[PDB]
Amino acid sequence: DPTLEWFLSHCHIHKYPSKSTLIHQGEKAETLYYIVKGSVAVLIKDEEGKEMILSYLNQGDFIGELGLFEEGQERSAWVRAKTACEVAEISYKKFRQLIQVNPDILMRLSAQMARRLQVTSEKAGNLAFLDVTGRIAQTLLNLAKQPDAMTHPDGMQIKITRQEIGQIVGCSRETVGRILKMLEDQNLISAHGKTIVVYG
Template identity: 25%
Template sequence: MIAIELLEKYGAVKKFYDKASVIFEEGNLPTHYYQIITGEVKMNNYNDDGREFIQGIFYKNQSFGEPPLFLNQKYPASAVSVEDSQILFLPKTNFMKMLEENASISIKIIENLAQRLYYKSVMAAEMSTHEPEHRVLKLIDHGIEYFNFKKDANGYLINFTRQQIGDLTGLRVETVIRTIKALEKKGVLKIINRKVYR
């Protein structure tokens, strides 16, 4: 999203996180801007029963955790590396200075936050009013549009696990599996070597 060279100019440092490493914890105050160089990060919570709810999944060149940074509020979720990841982190004061001195970057950040807010609003409505098939397709189509899923001869490879789809839509994994099979029968999705394509 923001050029690595620009972030480094303002003091950003690269850090490597092994798979399943906690980058920051729910309830902590934000101190840095984070951007992924390689890997994948999820922001998640657990309910009282220990069930995970994924707030968002982020990929290469994407940033995460900015809203609390601007509001100086505690993180509402933890950030955890889904796979081995290299992440740039920039101290909050340096980040704010960079935004003040680079208007085009500020606009890019605003657009990014607006897109996430829009997605959350759409998915909140989906989860409260629509059937599983509709929810799953909405999430997949959002992923294709915003997460740059790769396209090949089979279509777009959906880079979400069944568990992640469940956690992002509020559905049980069993329901997700049944729903994907039903959508395959209707010709809406393809399953090739256990991978889902749209």
């Protein structure tokens, strides 16, 4: 991948342990990132710091792109390493020079913006159409259809903490706890184990 490697030679590259914060919402946006290895969560918060994950981003993903096309913008979200990460960074100013040399690097970036918009639009859809019970139910169902969902004699089973579920739908761990109990008692799932079984 000649264009990528060229792009990266113009970056500086650093390692970040899991749980460390790469981007703080509200900071001035002046640099672009690219994930060389690992995974990050893109997070927003309510006024009391309850979190919602807008996306996971993985190796090959650009981050910090949204301040690129107009000066004076702030980071729109927190971005937090979910595993140990290797992350390339480059100033918007140097990136813009790179685009002049070869606009393919802009194509790649824009393709990812367009995917993100489709996915975030779909999520806003579910947030409008579903209450917190439906959100959690549709999350568990989505997760059971993932390539990594394990077969179970009674349906599919998943590994996912209550806090992670809470991050997906933007509710507390305890709210998740209560609604999982309700869904168990409605005979839709079982969560009495260290994992979750979605029936059917």
